[PDB]
Design a protein around this motif. Structure first.
Motif, mmCIF file in Angstrom:
data_model
loop_
_atom_site.group_PDB
_atom_site.id
_atom_site.type_symbol
_atom_site.label_atom_id
_atom_site.label_comp_id
_atom_site.label_asym_id
_atom_site.label_seq_id
_atom_site.Cartn_x
_atom_site.Cartn_y
_atom_site.Cartn_z
ATOM 1 N N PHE A 292 -48.404 -51.411 -27.260
ATOM 2 C CA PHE A 292 -49.624 -50.895 -26.479
ATOM 3 C C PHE A 292 -51.027 -51.159 -27.122
ATOM 4 N N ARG A 293 -52.157 -51.425 -26.372
ATOM 5 C CA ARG A 293 -53.410 -51.094 -26.920
ATOM 6 C C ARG A 293 -53.596 -49.898 -27.658
ATOM 7 N N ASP A 294 -54.208 -49.870 -28.690
ATOM 8 C CA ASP A 294 -54.453 -48.711 -29.423
ATOM 9 C C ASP A 294 -55.105 -47.627 -29.130
ATOM 10 N N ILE A 295 -54.709 -46.732 -28.881
ATOM 11 C CA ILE A 295 -55.957 -45.612 -28.057
ATOM 12 C C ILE A 295 -56.013 -44.278 -28.934
ATOM 13 N N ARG A 296 -55.666 -44.393 -30.217
ATOM 14 C CA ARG A 296 -55.654 -43.410 -30.859
ATOM 15 C C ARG A 296 -57.284 -42.667 -30.942
ATOM 16 N N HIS A 297 -58.153 -43.602 -31.129
ATOM 17 C CA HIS A 297 -59.410 -43.179 -31.100
ATOM 18 C C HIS A 297 -60.060 -42.503 -29.960
ATOM 19 N N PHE A 298 -59.225 -42.495 -28.838
ATOM 20 C CA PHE A 298 -59.595 -41.787 -27.741
ATOM 21 C C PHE A 298 -59.058 -40.320 -27.711
ATOM 22 N N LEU A 299 -58.172 -39.962 -28.609
ATOM 23 C CA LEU A 299 -57.539 -38.631 -28.579
ATOM 24 C C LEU A 299 -58.519 -37.663 -29.475
ATOM 25 N N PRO A 300 -58.654 -36.247 -28.870
ATOM 26 C CA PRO A 300 -59.402 -35.377 -29.442
ATOM 27 C C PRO A 300 -58.715 -34.887 -30.860
ATOM 28 N N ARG A 301 -59.592 -34.558 -31.721
ATOM 29 C CA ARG A 301 -59.481 -34.168 -32.980
ATOM 30 C C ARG A 301 -58.865 -32.602 -32.969
ATOM 31 N N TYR A 302 -59.484 -31.933 -32.113
ATOM 32 C CA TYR A 302 -59.165 -30.493 -32.101
ATOM 33 C C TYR A 302 -58.859 -30.111 -30.629
ATOM 34 N N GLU A 303 -58.231 -28.690 -30.576
ATOM 35 C CA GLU A 303 -58.192 -28.014 -29.345
ATOM 36 C C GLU A 303 -59.608 -28.012 -28.770
ATOM 37 N N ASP A 304 -59.725 -27.692 -27.493
ATOM 38 C CA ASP A 304 -60.925 -27.625 -26.806
ATOM 39 C C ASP A 304 -60.529 -27.530 -25.250
ATOM 40 N N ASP A 305 -61.696 -27.023 -24.669
ATOM 41 C CA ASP A 305 -61.687 -26.848 -23.168
ATOM 42 C C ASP A 305 -62.757 -28.071 -22.610
ATOM 43 N N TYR A 306 -62.462 -28.442 -21.452
ATOM 44 C CA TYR A 306 -63.135 -29.915 -20.815
ATOM 45 C C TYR A 306 -63.623 -29.713 -19.470
ATOM 46 N N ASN A 307 -64.506 -30.406 -19.198
ATOM 47 C CA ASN A 307 -65.146 -30.527 -17.670
ATOM 48 C C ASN A 307 -64.602 -31.720 -16.791
ATOM 49 N N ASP A 308 -64.047 -31.357 -15.566
ATOM 50 C CA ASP A 308 -64.076 -32.584 -14.489
ATOM 51 C C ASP A 308 -63.125 -33.622 -14.922
ATOM 52 N N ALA A 309 -61.994 -33.212 -15.414
ATOM 53 C CA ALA A 309 -60.942 -34.145 -15.978
ATOM 54 C C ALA A 309 -60.136 -34.799 -14.719
ATOM 55 N N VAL A 310 -59.673 -35.906 -14.919
ATOM 56 C CA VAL A 310 -58.882 -36.621 -13.863
ATOM 57 C C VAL A 310 -57.316 -36.598 -14.544
ATOM 58 N N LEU A 311 -56.119 -36.201 -13.585
ATOM 59 C CA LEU A 311 -54.925 -36.645 -13.827
ATOM 60 C C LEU A 311 -54.525 -37.669 -13.329
ATOM 61 N N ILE B 118 -56.381 -36.365 -23.372
ATOM 62 C CA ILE B 118 -56.520 -34.986 -23.783
ATOM 63 C C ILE B 118 -55.250 -34.440 -23.682
ATOM 64 N N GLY B 119 -54.263 -35.034 -22.899
ATOM 65 C CA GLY B 119 -52.882 -34.470 -22.746
ATOM 66 C C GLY B 119 -52.111 -35.118 -21.643
ATOM 67 N N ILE B 120 -50.853 -34.537 -21.389
ATOM 68 C CA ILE B 120 -49.964 -35.036 -20.334
ATOM 69 C C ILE B 120 -49.430 -34.021 -19.566
ATOM 70 N N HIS B 121 -49.192 -34.192 -18.172
ATOM 71 C CA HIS B 121 -48.942 -33.171 -17.518
ATOM 72 C C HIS B 121 -47.455 -32.632 -17.640
#
Ligand code: G86
Ligand code: G86
Lengths: 188, 188
Positions: free
Chosen positions: B83-102, B158-161
Motif C-alpha cells: 500500500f502507498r504509505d499514508i501514515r503522514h495523513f493520520l491525525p496525531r491527536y483526537e479532534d473534532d472536524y468539519n465537512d467530512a467525507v465517508l 481520521i477514522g473508519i465507519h
C-alpha cells in the motif's frame, strides 16, 4: 477529475425525494415547479415529495417521433417553493461525456456521489422489455435505489438514471429543448 | 466544501474490498501490507481481498488501557502489492472536524462518496452492546454495507465507519501512533 462540486450544488438546490406506488426516486427540479422522474415510476395524480403528499398538476411521459419511450416524465407540482432555474445547464444536443458523477437523494441515501466514468450516447435499449431511445450508458454497477439519480459533468446536467444490468448503468437524456416555454397543444 | 478530491485519491490507491465470515467491508491499507478493518468483522487466519483468498499474517484487535474495545483491528496481509504509505495523513491527536467525507469501496458500491458534515469526538458508545471508546460521530443516516468506510477531511484520514442508529453514524478513530514502527512484545 469528476465535478463533485457542481454535482453537489445541483443536489443541494435542485433535488427532492419523490415517492410513488413504485417506491422512492431521486427527483430533479428543473425550473419553477417543474421536475423530472423516470417514466417507470408510474406517477399518478398525487405524489410524495420529501414525505409531503403533493398534487401532480401535469405529467408528460416523453416519447420520440417513432412513438418510443424516452423514459423521462416531466411533472408540474402543486407546491410553494420554486426550483432554481437550471435549464441553462442542460445540453443542447446528444453527446458523449467524460468523468461523470451520478448523484442520489433518497430516504436511504440523502446525499451520495458516484463517479461513473465515461458516458456514451448508447441509443436503443430494451429497458425492462420496453423499447427505449436516447439512452446514455456508463460502465458502473448501478443498483436499485438509484433511479432518478442525476448524472452530471461540470456545468452540465445530462440525464437521470433509469436502469442497469449489474455491470453497466443507463440514464435517460435530458435535453434543453424538453423544457423551453412553448406550444398550445392538447396533450392528454 | 467537502474534500472529495482527497477522498478519491485515498479510495483509488488505498482501499480494497475485504470479506470475512461477517460479510464485506471497505478496507483501508495504511502502509506496506498493513490495513485496518472494524473489529466486529471477526478476521480469522485468512480473508478475501478483492475476492482473492489471502493469509492474515497478523491481526491486532485494538483496546485502550482501560481494556476497552477501540473497534479497530490492524491486519498484516500476505500479498504482493504494497500500500502507498499514508501514515503522514493520520491525525496525531483526537479532534473534532468539519465537512467530512465517508467513502465506501465494496462489491455493491465499488466507489461512493458521502458528505457527512461535522464530525465530533464523541468518546464512549455501547456499540452493539460492546463498550467502545474513542468514537467519532456524525449526523448522517449511515447504513449496513458502509462499515470500514473511510472518513476523511482534506489532508486527513481520521477514522473508519463502524456503526449507526438510523440518524447518526459512528467511526473508530485512527491515530498516527497506531502505526509507528515499534516495540518487541508478545501480543497473542
Ligand atoms: C431503478 C428503479 C428501481 O429500483 O425500482 C423498480 C420498480 C432501477 C435501477 C437498475 C436496477 C438494476 N440496476 C440498476 O441500475 N431500474 C430498473 O429497475 C429498471 C425499470 C425501472 C423501474 C422503475 C423506474 C425506472 C426504471 N429496470 C432495469 O434496470 C432492468 N434492466 C434491464 O432490463 O437491462 C437490459 C436487460 C435491457 C440490459 C433490470 C431490473 O433487469 C435485469 C438486468 C435485472 C434483468
Ligand atoms: C456495519 C457492519 C454491518 O453492516 O454488518 C453487521 C455484521 C454496520 C453499520 C451500521 C448499521 C446500522 N447503520 C450503520 O451505520 N455496523 C454495525 O452493524 C454495528 C456492529 C458491527 C458489526 C460488524 C462490524 C462493525 C460493527 N452495529 C451497529 O451499528 C448497531 N448500532 C448501535 O448499537 O448503536 C447504539 C444503540 C449504540 C446507539 C446497530 C445494528 O444497532 C441498532 C441501532 C439497529 C439497534
Amino acid at each position: 477529475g469528476p465535478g463533485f462540486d457542481f454535482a453537489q450544488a445541483i443536489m443541494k438546490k435542485n433535488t427532492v425525494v419523490a415517492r410513488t406506488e413504485k417506491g422512492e426516486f431521486t427527483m430533479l427540479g428543473v425550473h419553477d415547479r417543474v421536475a423530472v422522474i423516470p417514466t417507470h415510476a408510474s406517477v399518478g395524480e398525487t405524489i410524495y415529495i420529501n414525505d409531503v403528499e403533493t398534487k401532480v398538476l401535469d405529467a408528460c411521459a416523453l416519447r420520440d417521433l417513432t412513438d418510443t419511450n424516452l423514459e423521462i416524465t416531466i411533472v408540474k407540482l402543486d407546491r410553494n417553493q420554486k426550483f432554481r432555474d437550471i435549464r441553462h445547464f442542460l445540453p443542447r444536443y446528444e453527446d458523449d461525456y467524460n468523468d461523470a458523477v451520478l448523484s442520489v437523494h433518497t430516504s436511504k441515501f440523502p446525499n451520495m456521489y458516484i463517479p461513473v466514468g465515461q458516458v456514451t450516447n448508447y441509443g436503443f435499449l430494451n429497458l425492462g422489455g420496453t423499447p427505449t431511445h436516447r439512452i446514455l450508458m456508463y460502465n458502473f454497477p448501478t443498483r436499485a435505489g438509484q433511479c432518478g439519480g442525476v448524472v452530471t459533468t461540470t456545468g452540465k446536467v445530462i440525464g437521470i438514471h433509469v436502469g442497469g444490468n449489474g455491470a453497466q448503468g443507463f440514464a435517460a437524456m435530458l435535453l434543453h429543448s424538453y423544457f423551453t416555454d412553448t406550444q398550445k397543444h392538447h396533450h392528454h
